[PDB]
Amino acid sequence: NDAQLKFANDVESRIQRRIEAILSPIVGNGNVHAQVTAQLDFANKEQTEEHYSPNGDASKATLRSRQLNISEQVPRSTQRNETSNYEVDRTIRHTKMNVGDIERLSVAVVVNYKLPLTADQMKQIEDLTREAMGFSDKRGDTLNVVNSPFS
């Protein structure tokens, strides 16, 4: 039950090593630190969709029987019985979702001075980090990069 903590530390070490080894070429070998807080999903979570295609349209129905009596007298006392049996296009996914996905990432990046870095270089550094995390606004990952003199 501490294996989960070891595992999340492994994931954060991977992404942290990645950001450091991708941004070390630009800023310097030791002028950058990153600590990534990965919240991981450890819920066992199956799922079983079962979709059917709507066969409401008679031009894409698929009958198997059709017993269609049409009486008609003429006091136009008509009639129209109409049985049917259809066949249905049925998809059945049976997912057994993963134990250990990343629900969300949080990355904090500090980059040393040189003199404050230029704004364009800051934008492109943010973009590199955004690609190195695997940033996904779907998961709501949040990245914060700052430049401030070290000590």
Next chain:
Amino acid sequence: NDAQLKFANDVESRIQRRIEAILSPIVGNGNVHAQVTAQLDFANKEQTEEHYSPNGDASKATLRSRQLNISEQVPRSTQRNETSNYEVDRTIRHTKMNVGDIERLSVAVVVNYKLPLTADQMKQIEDLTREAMGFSDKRGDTLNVVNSPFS
């Protein structure tokens, strides 16, 4: 049953080490302390949703039979029997939620003086810490950072 206390201490040690090793570059090697109080959920908690898609709309129903008699005399003594059988798109999630999530985080950060730190630096330090915890206003995590001379 003390394994839970050891486990929560492990989680708080991880997040505390994280905040210290992310903010140590800026403020100094020992000019920051953080103690994180993690309340963890240890309830066994399964769950079994079972959703069905509304097949009220005849254009997305999926019949399997339809026995549709329509008598009509003319004293317009009509009639319209209409049996049906449908087929339904049925999802079945079976979650077995995790034992040891973080229900909420509480972080207290103290940062040493230098002379009181500037307000902009304080904002950016708060943001770094907010990313290092994995701050989520969903869980109602609460962070409090203060700057005050040590002893």
Next chain:
Amino acid sequence: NDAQLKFANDVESRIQRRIEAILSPIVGNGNVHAQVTAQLDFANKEQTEEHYSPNGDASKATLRSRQLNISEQVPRSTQRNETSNYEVDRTIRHTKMNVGDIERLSVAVVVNYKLPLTADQMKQIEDLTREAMGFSDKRGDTLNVVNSPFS
């Protein structure tokens, strides 16, 4: 059956060590004492919700059959039988709540003099302690901090 007393003493020792090691940087190494009285819930307490989604709205019902006869003569002696069978979205949580939660916390904090401490420093010390306990007005935790010369 004394394991419960050992356990509650463990929890109070953790939170007390936490408050002491978070406020020791500010006030001094030995100018603060805290004794935390944790009332813990040791009741075995399961739970089994079982929610259903209201399928009163015909636009989100999910039929499985519908046998809908509509006779009508004209003395407008009408009729409308209307059977139905529905399918229902059914969630089933099966919680087995924890044995050893904290029902409530009570923290008493004494901080030594220096000359009485300033009021702003007192507010921020109260806030640090409030975060270090894991204060939750939901549990009705109560914190009382006082400054008064030691002996």
Next chain:
Amino acid sequence: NDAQLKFANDVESRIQRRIEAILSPIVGNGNVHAQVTAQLDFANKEQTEEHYSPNGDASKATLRSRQLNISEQVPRSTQRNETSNYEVDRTIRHTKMNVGDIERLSVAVVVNYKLPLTADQMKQIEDLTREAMGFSDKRGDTLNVVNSPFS
């Protein structure tokens, strides 16, 4: 359960080696770095489509029986019973999807200076990298190439 992390590191090492060994001819042996963040799908995920071809059109139906009584008196009290049985063209795919696909790729490319590289060379380098990843806007792969002097 760490085999997944080893596996994803393997995939990223393959694609990173590929980009480096395809762009090393142009920019130089060590004037390029690439770190590829591959998010992999590890869900067990079966699937069973079952399509039927619409036999609504009588010119492409395939009867097996047809009991077609047509009474007619002349007060033109006609009648037309018409049973049927059809046969249906039924496809049955049974996929057992892969464990370890790439849901998405993220590539960050840094290329050293020479003097900033020309824009046309930058476009063609981006295109080479786009082919070396196996870029697919279907998966939403994201590539970011930048040129900036190393250190």
Next chain:
Amino acid sequence: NDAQLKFANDVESRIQRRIEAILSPIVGNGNVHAQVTAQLDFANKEQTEEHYSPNGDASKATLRSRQLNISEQVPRSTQRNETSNYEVDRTIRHTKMNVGDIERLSVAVVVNYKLPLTADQMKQIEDLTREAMGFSDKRGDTLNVVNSPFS
């Protein structure tokens, strides 16, 4: 489960060796590099079509019985019962698709200078590579050839 990565590397090595050993005669023994990113389909995927030929046309039906009563009185109170039984031409394919097809190819080709190569030679080199991959716009294979001085 790493056998898939070894296998895809094998396929890419085959196609890369092929492009190199087909274009080496023209451009030179070492004036060309190619790295081919093959995305392979590893899904188990069966399939079972079952087609029937439409026997709607009476001139290509194939009866097995036909019980065809035709009463007729003359008040022309006619009648025409007409049973039938047909026989149907039924094809049954049972595919068990391959594990390891190439869903898509991506080829990046770099060719050294000599002075930039002529445009006609570039077109014919692109065509040779297009044949050496086994280019198929059905799979959406993508090829990108560029000429740029090496280093």
